[PDB]
Amino acid sequence: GYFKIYSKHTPIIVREPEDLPQGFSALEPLVDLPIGINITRFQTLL
Amino acid sequence: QKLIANQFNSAIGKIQDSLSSTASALGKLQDVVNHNAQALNTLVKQLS
Amino acid sequence: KNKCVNFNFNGLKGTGVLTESNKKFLPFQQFGRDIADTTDAVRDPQTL
Ligand SMILES: *[C@@H]1O[C@H](CO)[C@@H](O)[C@H](O)[C@H]1NC(C)=O
């Protein structure tokens, strides 16, 4: 059914496109919306 | 007499050294508590 | 508070003493189960 979203904001320091850092971070849910939508693809928006 | 007494004292003083070290000397007493805790943990974990 | 009372929190039943929490709950969750499916803390629906 519904569409769940998990996220966490964290300030880091890294080479700016490269080497996604180490460590651990738990992603907390923010908003759940009760839709009945079938999703097969998704398109990012820059 | 003094040699036997000194050997007995040196063997008794090494018992506390051999018991406080190696971290697994009292395994036969720890395993009973581990089994009695594992059974009580399994009895609650099968209620779900 | 501080009394054995029957409750009904959003469908689930149970019997217990509904005292204070003294907890550190994150605001996205409701239940507070410790080991098994027993309910330690359940959030209020009006006062939250
Ligand atoms: C109704 O529920 C809301 C929960 O957001 C609570 O803030 C409010 O005080 C409640 N009102 C009454 C009259 O219980």
Give CA–CA dist B24/C8, Å, rounded: 50
Spatial distance between the Cα atoms of C44 and C7, rounded to a whole number of angstroms: 11
Strand partners, C4: C17
- The yes-or-no reply on B/A contact (3 CB pairs or more, < 8 Å) is no
Q: Determination method here?
A: cryo-EM
Calpha distance A32→A4 (Å, rounded): 5
| Measured distance CA(A8)–CA(A28) in Å, rounded | 6
Interface of A with C in 14-43 (CB under 8 A): 28-30
What is chain B's length?
48
| Contact status, residue C41 vs residue C23, Cβ threshold 8 Å | yes
Question: Cα–Cα–Cα angle for A27, A29, A30, nearest 5°?
Answer: 125
d(CA C8, CA C39): 12
Distance CA C27, CA C4 (A): 27
Q: Which residues of chain B does C35 touch, with a Cβ-Cβ cutoff of 8 Å?
A: 44-45
Does C28 reach chain A within 8 Å, measured CB to CB? yes
Resolution (A): 2.6
Count of CB atoms situated within 10 Å of the CB of C47:
5
Phi, psi of A37, rounded to the nearest 5 degrees:
-90, 135
